[PDB]
Amino acid sequence: FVCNENIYMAPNAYTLLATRMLNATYCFQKALTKIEKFPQYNPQEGYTYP
Amino acid sequence: QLLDVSRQIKSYWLTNSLSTSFPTVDYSEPDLEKVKRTLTKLQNHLLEVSLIE
């Protein structure tokens, strides 16, 4: 790729979409791992947040 | 979720109106004849009474 006095890789569609998916996944895993430790469960009171 | 279900079942069992009794802690005796006599005694304060007829 050549643009505005710049050279670029212009890569393969698979690697672009794959890396995108990988980012999204990583966000998910991080958010879920943060949330999963937090909530409290008491069986009569229910699910509680401190 | 299973724990929620089991709790509900316990509650249901305890909600059922099958007690059919009372705690009943009794065993302090009436001694009615004394209450009659104290009643009359009070009611006739300062009163000269006579026999039935």
Can you give the resolution of this entry in Å?
3.4
- What determination technique applies here? X-ray
User: Considering only residues 1 to 50 of chain A, which have any Cβ-Cβ distance to chain B shorter than 8 Å?
Assistant: 43-44
Report the Cα B52 to chain-centroid distance in Å: 35
Name chain A contacts of B3, Cβ cutoff 8 Å. Answer: 43
Instruction: Say if the Cβ atoms of B4 and A44 lie within 8 Å.
Output: no
Which tokens in the block code for residue A8?
């670029």
Whether residue B3 contacts residue B11, with contact meaning beta carbons closer than 8 Å, is answered with no
Interface residues of B toward A, Cβ cutoff 8 Å, are: 3-4, 7
Please name the residues in contact with A44: beta carbons below 8 A apart, sequence gap of 6 or more: B7
Please name the residues in contact with A48: beta carbons below 8 A apart, sequence gap of 6 or more: A39, A40, A41, A42
Whether residue A50 contacts residue A37, with contact meaning beta carbons closer than 8 Å, is answered with no
Report the Cα A28 to chain-centroid distance in Å: 4
